[PDB]
């Protein structure tokens, strides 16, 4: 399933480029990605990838009339020709684009942030099953980072300014005569919010992580040990000391990862080519992975691709293209205030989360259907004498509808015939069943919260320290309840992920 994704995405990321270039009409003195100026963004689709862009927004016809409309370029030798109103830059270099994030939220917050486009948005949410597995992301123990090593090349700037004199009259007509908010919801929704301002062409390395931040046990943050092992992996200058040998090892044991090449000859080449996952790499180890991506990092000038956005500028508002500041100013507003917040919302992930609770006896430990059962390293009864048992729902948190309600906490009633004040809920089975003790788990439900909501509860089995961030189930006067009545040690612990 996963080779797969990898030439699904190559098909994509081939195709567009074929299809954008084909549709520009430029020659082919005309340098690569030069159609990719002036050419509309799905900012809520997939980091700097040609899939996500929409619509060429200059007039190719007019563009392609007159050979006055293009200037000289110089790139690695080649005597090449570009649009006037885009501005190369030749670079050469390699640098790295990295996001990271200790929830998924963080993380949609952080890569959102690398559009360079103000506000708390979640843009390009749609590389998220592109960067992570699906189930991953909703998961309360991971914590999730994307590593991009690209070569930049060279860099295409504009602006909307210099794109004006090129516009289609389609567009032009479309901006000046959004009316209503539906018109400017069509508008965003048919034409694309932005337009790439600012690109890189070349090639890139990606590999990216979903890691358990409890079973990692990491000395340095995640972030930069996932960067060291992305380095390490392909034999690239990777930290030994304060940790790092051991912290890339925990890394890679407790995460998926998952990698991608964009750009250079993808055919014969391959960065990840000679790849290594070893603790301890030998000599003709590493020098096979750094020969696999030199190979491939050669390959790059001839075959470059759009791979990332530039530092400046990179996306531009549809409505700077518009003659009328006050039109503008109005369509600025609309995205700002109306769309960009009602789009972000539809695209939020949060963890699945714990909404019911069952207790009863259970003599083979099986949940009814939907539901999951306790356990401490494996399945565990509640209490062994009686086989009590407990199972647990976990619902998805979906944007669109109202969700269920979550439940914020956890306690024990030792007494035989009292109910909990409040919204407490108590449940019926008493876990003791000793004739002559009582045990009761109660919960204390609320509307959906994120941050407060319950992600997991566990079983310490007789492995006795409470772990962090998690919480005991304490009984009326704040101690611990041993819930197994046989030679052995039972303690019930819960987490909301803080
Ligand atoms: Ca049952
Ligand atoms: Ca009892």
Redesign the pocket.
Same mark, same amino acid.
């Given at each position: 399933k996963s080779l797969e994704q990898e030439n699904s995405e190559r098909d994509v990321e081939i195709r567009d480029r074929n299809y954008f270039r084909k549709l520009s009409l430029f020659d082919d003195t005309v340098i690569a990605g030069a159609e990719m100026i002036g050419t509309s963004y799905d900012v809520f689709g997939k980091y700097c990838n040609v899939g996500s862009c929409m619509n060429s927004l200059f007039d190719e016809r007019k563009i392609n009339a007159s050979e006055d409309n293009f200037k000289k370029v110089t790139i690695l030798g080649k005597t090449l020709k570009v649009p006037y109103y885009i501005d190369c830059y030749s670079v050469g270099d390699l640098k790295y684009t990295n996001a990271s994030g200790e929830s998924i939220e963080s993380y949609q917050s952080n890569i959102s942030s690398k559009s360079r486009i103000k506000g708390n948005y979640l843009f390009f949410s749609a590389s998220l099953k592109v960067d992570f597995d699906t189930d991953s992301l909703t998961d309360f123990e991971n914590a999730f980072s994307r590593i991009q090593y690209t070569y930049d090349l060279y860099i295409l700037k504009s602006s909307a300014e210099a794109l004006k004199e090129f516009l289609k009259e389609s567009v032009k007509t479309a901006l000046d005569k959004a009316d209503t908010e539906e018109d400017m919801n069509d508008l965003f929704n048919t034409w694309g919010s932005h337009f790439l301002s600012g690109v890189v062409m070349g090639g890139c390395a990606q590999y990216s992580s979903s890691t358990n931040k409890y079973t990692s046990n990491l000395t340095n943050s995640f972030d930069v040990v996932a960067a060291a092992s992305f380095a390490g992996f392909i034999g690239l200058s990777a930290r030994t000391g304060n940790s790092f040998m051991e912290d890339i090892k925990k890394f890679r044991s407790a995460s998926n990862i998952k990698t991608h090449a964009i750009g250079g000859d993808l055919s014969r080449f391959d960065p990840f080519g000679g790849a290594t996952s070893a603790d301890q790499p030998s000599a003709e180890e590493i020098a096979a992975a750094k020969k696999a991506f030199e190979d491939w990092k050669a390959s790059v000038p001839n075959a470059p691709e759009l791979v990332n956005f530039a530092d400046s500028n990179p996306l531009t508002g549809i409505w700077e293209l518009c003659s009328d500041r006050t039109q503008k100013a109005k369509l600025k507003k609309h995205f700002e205030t109306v769309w960009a917040p009602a789009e972000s919302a539809k695209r939020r992930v949060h963890a699945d989360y714990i909404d019911e609770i #069952?207790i009863? #006896?259970?003599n083979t430990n099986t949940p009814?259907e939907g539901y999951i059962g306790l356990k401490s390293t494996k399945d565990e009864n509640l209490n062994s004498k009686g086989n009590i048992?407990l199972?647990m729902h976990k619902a998805k948190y979906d944007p669109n509808i109202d969700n269920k309600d979550c439940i914020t906490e956890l306690k024990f009633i030792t007494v035989r015939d009292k109910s909990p004040e409040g919204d407490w809920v108590k449940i019926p089975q008493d876990i003791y069943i000793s004739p002559n003790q009582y045990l009761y788990l109660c919960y204390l439900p609320a509307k959906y919260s994120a941050e407060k909501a319950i992600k997991d509860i566990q079983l310490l089995c007789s492995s006795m320290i409470l772990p962090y961030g998690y919480n005991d189930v304490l009984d009326e006067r704040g101690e611990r309840a041993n819930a197994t009545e046989d030679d052995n040690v039972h303690y019930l612990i819960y987490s909301a992920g803080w």
């Amino acid at each position: 399933k996963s080779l797969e994704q990898e030439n699904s995405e190559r098909d994509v990321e081939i195709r567009d480029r074929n299809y954008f270039r084909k549709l520009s009409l430029f020659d082919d003195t005309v340098i690569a990605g030069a159609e990719m100026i002036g050419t509309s963004y799905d900012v809520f689709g997939k980091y700097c990838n040609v899939g996500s862009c929409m619509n060429s927004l200059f007039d190719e016809r007019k563009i392609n009339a007159s050979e006055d409309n293009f200037k000289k370029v110089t790139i690695l030798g080649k005597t090449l020709k570009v649009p006037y109103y885009i501005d190369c830059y030749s670079v050469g270099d390699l640098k790295y684009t990295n996001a990271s994030g200790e929830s998924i939220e963080s993380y949609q917050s952080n890569i959102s942030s690398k559009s360079r486009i103000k506000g708390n948005y979640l843009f390009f949410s749609a590389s998220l099953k592109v960067d992570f597995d699906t189930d991953s992301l909703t998961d309360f123990e991971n914590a999730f980072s994307r590593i991009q090593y690209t070569y930049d090349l060279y860099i295409l700037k504009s602006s909307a300014e210099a794109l004006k004199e090129f516009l289609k009259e389609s567009v032009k007509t479309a901006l000046d005569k959004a009316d209503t908010e539906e018109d400017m919801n069509d508008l965003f929704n048919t034409w694309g919010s932005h337009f790439l301002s600012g690109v890189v062409m070349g090639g890139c390395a990606q590999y990216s992580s979903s890691t358990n931040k409890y079973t990692s046990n990491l000395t340095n943050s995640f972030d930069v040990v996932a960067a060291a092992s992305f380095a390490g992996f392909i034999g690239l200058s990777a930290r030994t000391g304060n940790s790092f040998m051991e912290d890339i090892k925990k890394f890679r044991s407790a995460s998926n990862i998952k990698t991608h090449a964009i750009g250079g000859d993808l055919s014969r080449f391959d960065p990840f080519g000679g790849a290594t996952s070893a603790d301890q790499p030998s000599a003709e180890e590493i020098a096979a992975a750094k020969k696999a991506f030199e190979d491939w990092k050669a390959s790059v000038p001839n075959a470059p691709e759009l791979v990332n956005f530039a530092d400046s500028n990179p996306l531009t508002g549809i409505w700077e293209l518009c003659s009328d500041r006050t039109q503008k100013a109005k369509l600025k507003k609309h995205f700002e205030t109306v769309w960009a917040p009602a789009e972000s919302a539809k695209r939020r992930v949060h963890a699945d989360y714990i909404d019911e609770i #069952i207790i009863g #006896i259970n003599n083979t430990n099986t949940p009814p259907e939907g539901y999951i059962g306790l356990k401490s390293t494996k399945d565990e009864n509640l209490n062994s004498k009686g086989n009590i048992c407990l199972f647990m729902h976990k619902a998805k948190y979906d944007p669109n509808i109202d969700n269920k309600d979550c439940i914020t906490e956890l306690k024990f009633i030792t007494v035989r015939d009292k109910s909990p004040e409040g919204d407490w809920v108590k449940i019926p089975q008493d876990i003791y069943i000793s004739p002559n003790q009582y045990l009761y788990l109660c919960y204390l439900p609320a509307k959906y919260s994120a941050e407060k909501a319950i992600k997991d509860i566990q079983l310490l089995c007789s492995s006795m320290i409470l772990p962090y961030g998690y919480n005991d189930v304490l009984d009326e006067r704040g101690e611990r309840a041993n819930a197994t009545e046989d030679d052995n040690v039972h303690y019930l612990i819960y987490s909301a992920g803080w």
